[PDB]
Amino acid sequence: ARVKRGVIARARHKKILKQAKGYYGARSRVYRVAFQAVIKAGQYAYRDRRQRKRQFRQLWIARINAAARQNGISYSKFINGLKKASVEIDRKILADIAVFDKVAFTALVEKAKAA
Amino acid sequence: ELVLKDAQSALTVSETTFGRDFNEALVHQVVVAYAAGARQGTRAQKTRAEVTGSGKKPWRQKGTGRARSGSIKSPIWRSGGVTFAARPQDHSQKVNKKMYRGALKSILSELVRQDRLIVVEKFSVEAPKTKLLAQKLKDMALEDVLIITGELDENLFLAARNLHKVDVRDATGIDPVSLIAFDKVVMTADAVKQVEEMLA
Amino acid sequence: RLNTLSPAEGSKKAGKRLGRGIGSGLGKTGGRGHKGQKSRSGGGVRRGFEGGQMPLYRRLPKFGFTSRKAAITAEIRLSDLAKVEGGVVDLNTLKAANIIGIQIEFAKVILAGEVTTPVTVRGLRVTKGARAAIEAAGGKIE
Amino acid sequence: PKIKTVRGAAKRFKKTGKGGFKHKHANLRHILTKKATKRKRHLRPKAMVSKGDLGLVIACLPYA
RNA sequence: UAGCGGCGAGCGAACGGGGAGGAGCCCAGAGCCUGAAUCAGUGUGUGUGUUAGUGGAAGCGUCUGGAAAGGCGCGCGAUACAGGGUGACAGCCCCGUACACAAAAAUGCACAUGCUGUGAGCUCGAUGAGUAGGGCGGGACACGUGGUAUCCUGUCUGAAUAUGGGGGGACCAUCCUCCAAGGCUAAAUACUCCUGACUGACCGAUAGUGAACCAGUACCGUGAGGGAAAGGCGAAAAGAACCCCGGCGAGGGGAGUGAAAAAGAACCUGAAACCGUGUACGUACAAGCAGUGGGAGCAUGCUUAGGCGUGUGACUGCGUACCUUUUGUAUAAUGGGUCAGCGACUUAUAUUCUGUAGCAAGGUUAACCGAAUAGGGGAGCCGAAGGGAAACCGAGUCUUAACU
Ligand SMILES: [K+]
Ligand SMILES: [K+]
Ligand SMILES: [Mg+2]
Ligand SMILES: [Mg+2]
Ligand SMILES: [Mg+2]
Ligand SMILES: [Mg+2]
Ligand SMILES: [Mg+2]
Ligand SMILES: [Mg+2]
Ligand SMILES: [Mg+2]
Ligand SMILES: [Mg+2]
Ligand SMILES: [Mg+2]
Ligand SMILES: [Mg+2]
Ligand SMILES: [Mg+2]
Ligand SMILES: [Mg+2]
Ligand SMILES: [Mg+2]
Ligand SMILES: [Mg+2]
Ligand SMILES: [Mg+2]
Ligand SMILES: [Mg+2]
Ligand SMILES: [Mg+2]
Ligand SMILES: [Mg+2]
Ligand SMILES: [Mg+2]
Ligand SMILES: [Mg+2]
Ligand SMILES: [Mg+2]
Ligand SMILES: [Mg+2]
Ligand SMILES: [Mg+2]
Ligand SMILES: [Mg+2]
Ligand SMILES: [Mg+2]
Ligand SMILES: [Mg+2]
Ligand SMILES: [Mg+2]
Ligand SMILES: [Mg+2]
Ligand SMILES: [Mg+2]
Ligand SMILES: [Mg+2]
Ligand SMILES: [Mg+2]
Ligand SMILES: [Mg+2]
Ligand SMILES: [Mg+2]
Ligand SMILES: [Mg+2]
Ligand SMILES: [Mg+2]
Ligand SMILES: [Mg+2]
Ligand SMILES: [Mg+2]
Ligand SMILES: [Mg+2]
Ligand SMILES: [Mg+2]
Ligand SMILES: [Mg+2]
Ligand SMILES: [Mg+2]
Ligand SMILES: [Mg+2]
Ligand SMILES: [Mg+2]
Ligand SMILES: [Mg+2]
Ligand SMILES: [Mg+2]
Ligand SMILES: [Mg+2]
Ligand SMILES: [Mg+2]
Ligand SMILES: [Mg+2]
Ligand SMILES: [Mg+2]
Ligand SMILES: [Mg+2]
Ligand SMILES: [Mg+2]
Ligand SMILES: [Mg+2]
Ligand SMILES: [Mg+2]
Ligand SMILES: [Mg+2]
């Protein structure tokens, strides 16, 4: 028996165009172009789930290095000082304590000074 | 044995034919085969050979900027094509004698456990009238049935064409899908004697 | 109940359908490589073609001849001996039971398995191992 | 329709009990005086086809 | 399979067996005796059937809606619930349907059948010459001239004629077989331009016929010839009286029909590309597959008295499209303007292998007959033993003078 394939096409195109919804020019409107944009977007989305973790880790270290040199220590010594006193606090939090509770960040720099 | 509903006589029915285990694969195969045998398979499209058009190359190979063609009957053109046009074909398939018999035995054995099978004595309507047949199913307390008889009375047949949930047959003409499809089944003591002796 | 019926496990195998996307595994070239005579529609090569090298069935020499007498002789198995008429199995009576084909003048009983009743064979060739058995059952040949 | 046998192959081969095909050896039609006897003796008896070139033989003569 | 074959590609029988089907006679002529069997026509009978036909069963009260067959409750016919219509899905409103009856004429037939007309039983005797065969050259037979039988012949020739001749696959001799060179012949089988039913795991307007529409038309070609596109308002035209702007126009707006006029003749639904109009945010010191991860601001909704979602996306890290072909492509190699539709591993028959079901030293039927997808029909196939080129032997056998 014959199968008209008109209902199903638009179903699977509309799925894709709805993902491209937002893109500039044809990349939004036109299926052929959108399909590529949607896939490349996926590739990048996958690729940057990895880079998200790196970028933030740089960004924290920068904050900590800045915050330490206010108190008079370079990051490399500050981390080695913390690790030598078996301190387990990660970068993410150190970058938060750097910004927020500077009285608490000061005491970490003393805690690290011992070693 | 199988006791009757208006006698209580000990019918010594065979154990090897009716007391059997169900075999779903075989039954499925036979019931599929029976359906597939019901196809007539009358249908045809027409390939680029049989389409009504010229042989002529519409335009020459090179020179023109268009995409090389050599037919207005080719499947990638609007009008004329269907790459793989079906021909009228025989969809029926072989089922082995013993497979078929075994399936009928297997489905006819299951009705004893389901209690769909109703065995009866002298079952016959008085005259060719649906009014009687329709009323006499209420006393027996049935509805969607397959009546099977050895001594095929014309009176019973005539007045069961228009009745849809009833289907009358001869014991000779029992089927795989027919026994399975209908909810209840009605068999005469002669009919079961004939089926028992036929299947063996 | 008609809709309840399902086949056996591994009975139906779906079947390969070619050219239907990437996820299908096979698709774009229906499991038939890139290019060459084998990939082309109506491709491949005739039976016994080793690419211009003289094929095995021509470099080897032909031998023998088909005998006409070999087609009209049969090898009767001793197990199918006593399945006719008491113990009389000449040729036509053996032929009547559909043990050997019609146009078969000569025939020969060989050893195989089991004799119970005494069988007198006559007008028929018999094998030494069978003759020991047929006599050991009881029946005398000719 | 039915598969036709490659008749040329049917004459040069013969089916055995296990499934293999016996064939007659080559290099024994002519130019025999120069060939040593020890060859001519070993090229006389029938030989089984090697498993490498069996698939060709099975295809070109399927019926026995 | 046996054969044929640059023994390649390929082609490929017959005998014999199942069925379908059945049927046999005239002339190369004489006696007694003759219309008696036989057909080939004319009028003529019933069993009848075909081109007009007729009849042809049985439903309502409520609710919802523009409209009832619908939901809802009791019904009521069925040798009729095949099917089709009717303001939404009808067994019972109408057409029908089974089913019962139809023909003045034109008949299609098959048996009585008077009959221009045609010849039986049975004696004795005949039984198809430029022919069979041959030489040469071709062709047909599965058989390609080959060791090549057999039939047909263009050419050149030439028998014997039932105390006789042909065939039995070079050829020859006994046995078996038939009687050429003269004729007729129904059925099984092929086929559908065509006139009816009936069915589709056939299509549903780019499909299906080229052609659902006034299509083999328009149009193209000197001609042969090629050859399109183009379906649907609504239940019913009830197709918009009359006013208004306008060129006593096109088009529109009110009023009015209708259930509905973003159903108003382009008229069911009305997608996409494509072009618009408003609303929110962004955008005139900023470089690049235009996204992605971060991300303030800004515009906005919810419950709470604080958190969440949607839109936009300043700035900023990374980031050279997709396909094809390739050792290798952002490549400045190929292909694509876009969208919508169509567009590519199928079918039949054989064969081997895997799975799966049946039954098992057995398994299975084909055609076909069949109150028929039952059951008969095992003709046959395949298997149960091979070895040998083969005769032949056979749990062995081949090799060999013979095998430790
Ligand atoms: K009526
Ligand atoms: K003459
Ligand atoms: Mg989807
Ligand atoms: Mg161009
Ligand atoms: Mg173009
Ligand atoms: Mg078409
Ligand atoms: Mg197709
Ligand atoms: Mg797979
Ligand atoms: Mg795969
Ligand atoms: Mg792959
Ligand atoms: Mg390619
Ligand atoms: Mg290549
Ligand atoms: Mg290749
Ligand atoms: Mg070469
Ligand atoms: Mg037989
Ligand atoms: Mg051999
Ligand atoms: Mg070897
Ligand atoms: Mg041919
Ligand atoms: Mg009427
Ligand atoms: Mg009502
Ligand atoms: Mg009702
Ligand atoms: Mg409606
Ligand atoms: Mg009449
Ligand atoms: Mg009349
Ligand atoms: Mg004659
Ligand atoms: Mg001649
Ligand atoms: Mg001759
Ligand atoms: Mg030829
Ligand atoms: Mg001869
Ligand atoms: Mg002759
Ligand atoms: Mg001979
Ligand atoms: Mg004649
Ligand atoms: Mg005829
Ligand atoms: Mg005929
Ligand atoms: Mg159907
Ligand atoms: Mg459809
Ligand atoms: Mg069309
Ligand atoms: Mg259209
Ligand atoms: Mg449409
Ligand atoms: Mg209408
Ligand atoms: Mg004017
Ligand atoms: Mg509207
Ligand atoms: Mg329009
Ligand atoms: Mg409508
Ligand atoms: Mg519309
Ligand atoms: Mg625009
Ligand atoms: Mg600026
Ligand atoms: Mg730029
Ligand atoms: Mg720029
Ligand atoms: Mg960058
Ligand atoms: Mg690169
Ligand atoms: Mg490019
Ligand atoms: Mg460029
Ligand atoms: Mg390309
Ligand atoms: Mg281009
Ligand atoms: Mg053998």
Swiss-Prot record, chain A:
- Coiled-coil features, chain-numbered ranges: none
* Top-level taxon of origin: Bacteria
Q: Which InterPro entries match?
A: Ribosomal_bL20 (IPR005813), RIBOSOMAL_L20_CS (IPR049946), Ribosomal_protein_bL20_C (IPR035566)
Q: One Gene Ontology cellular component annotation?
A: cytosol
> What Pfam families does its record include?
Ribosomal_L20 (PF00453)
Q: Which UniProt keywords apply?
A: Ribonucleoprotein, Ribosomal protein, RNA-binding, rRNA-binding
Q: Give each disulfide bond as a residue pair.
A: none
Q: What SUPFAM superfamilies does the database record attribute to this sequence?
A: Ribosomal protein L20
GO MF terms, alphabetically ordered:
large ribosomal subunit rRNA binding; mRNA binding; mRNA regulatory element binding translation repressor activity; structural constituent of ribosome
User: One biological process GO term for this chain?
Assistant: ribosomal large subunit assembly
Q: Which family does it belong to?
A: Belongs to the bacterial ribosomal protein bL20 family.
Q: What does this protein do?
A: One of the primary rRNA binding proteins, it binds close to the 5'-end of the 23S rRNA. It is important during the early stages of 50S assembly.
| Quaternary structure note | Part of the 50S ribosomal subunit. Contacts L21.
Put simply, this protein is called: Large ribosomal subunit protein bL20
- Per the UniProt record, the source organism is Escherichia coli (strain K12)
Swiss-Prot record, chain B:
The annotated consequence of L133P reads: Does not regulate the S10 operon in vivo
Q: Which domain of life is it from?
A: Bacteria
Q: What are the GO MF terms of this UniProt record?
A: DNA binding; endoribonuclease inhibitor activity; mRNA 5'-UTR binding; RNA-binding transcription regulator activity; rRNA binding; structural constituent of ribosome; translation repressor activity
**Family label:** Belongs to the universal ribosomal protein uL4 family.
User: Which InterPro entries does its entry note?
Assistant: Ribosomal_uL4 (IPR002136), Ribosomal_uL4-like (IPR013005), Ribosomal_uL4_dom_sf (IPR023574)
Q: Does the keyword Transferase apply?
A: no
- Give an example GO cellular component term for this record: cytoplasm
Protein's recorded name: Large ribosomal subunit protein uL4
Residue ranges for the region (Disordered) are 43-70
Q: Which HAMAP family match?
A: Ribosomal_uL4_B
The record describes its quaternary structure and partners as: Part of the 50S ribosomal subunit. In TnaC-stalled ribosomes forms part of the binding pocket for L-Trp with the leader peptide and uL22.
GO BP, sorted A to Z: cytoplasmic translation; DNA-templated transcription termination; negative regulation of cytoplasmic translation; negative regulation of DNA-templated transcription; negative regulation of translation; response to antibiotic; ribosome assembly; transcriptional attenuation
Which keywords does this chain's UniProt record carry?
Answer: Antibiotic resistance, Repressor, Ribonucleoprotein, Ribosomal protein, RNA-binding, rRNA-binding, Transcription, Transcription regulation, Transcription termination, Translation regulation
The entry's stated outcome for T130I is: Does not regulate the S10 operon; assembles into ribosomes in vivo
The extra comment attached to this record reads: The erythromycin sensitive allele is dominant over the resistant allele.
**Signal peptide range:** none
Checking Pfam families in the record gives: Ribosomal_L4
Curated annotation (Swiss-Prot), chain C:
Composition-biased stretches, type Gly residues, lie in 20-30
Question: What Pfam families does this protein map onto?
Answer: Ribosomal_L27A
User: Do the record's keywords include Membrane?
Assistant: no
Q: Which PROSITE patterns match?
A: RIBOSOMAL_L15
What InterPro entries does this protein's entry cite?
Ribosomal_uL15, Ribosomal_uL15/eL18, Ribosomal_uL15/eL18_sf, Ribosomal_uL15_bac-type, Ribosomal_uL15_CS
Kindly list the GO molecular function terms attached to this UniProt entry: rRNA binding; structural constituent of ribosome
Keywords tagged on the record: Ribonucleoprotein, Ribosomal protein, RNA-binding, rRNA-binding
Query: Which SUPFAM superfamilies does the record cross-reference, listed alphabetically?
Result: Ribosomal proteins L15p and L18e
Its GO biological process terms?
A: cytoplasmic translation
Renumbered residue ranges of the record's region Disordered: 1-53
* Listed GO CC annotations: cytoplasm; cytosolic large ribosomal subunit
UniProt-listed Gene3D superfamilies: 3.100.10.10
The record's listing under NCBIfam families reads: rplO_bact
Name the family. Belongs to the universal ribosomal protein uL15 family.
Subunit record text: Part of the 50S ribosomal subunit. Contacts the 5S rRNA.
Instruction: Quote the function comment for this protein.
Output: This protein binds the 5S rRNA. It is required for the late stages of subunit assembly, and is essential for 5S rRNA assembly onto the ribosome.
Protein name in the entry: Large ribosomal subunit protein uL15
Originating organism: Escherichia coli (strain K12)
Curated annotation (Swiss-Prot), chain D:
Q: Name one Pfam family in it.
A: Ribosomal_L35p
- GO BP, sorted A to Z: cytoplasmic translation
Give start-end positions of Basic residues composition bias: 9-21
Q: Quick one: a GO cellular component term?
A: cytosolic large ribosomal subunit
What keywords would UniProt list here? Ribonucleoprotein, Ribosomal protein
Q: Which domain of life is it from?
A: Bacteria
According to the UniProt entry, its GO molecular function terms are: structural constituent of ribosome
Outline the segment boundaries, as ranges, of region: Disordered: 1-21
Matching InterPro entries, A to Z?
Ribosomal_bL35 (IPR001706), Ribosomal_bL35-like (IPR021137), Ribosomal_bL35_CS (IPR018265), Ribosomal_bL35_sf (IPR037229)
Q: Which NCBIfam families match?
A: rpmI_bact
Family designation: Belongs to the bacterial ribosomal protein bL35 family.
Q: How does it assemble?
A: Part of the 50S ribosomal subunit.
Q: What is this protein called?
A: Large ribosomal subunit protein bL35
Which species does this protein come from?
Escherichia coli (strain K12)
Q: Which gene encodes it?
A: rpmI
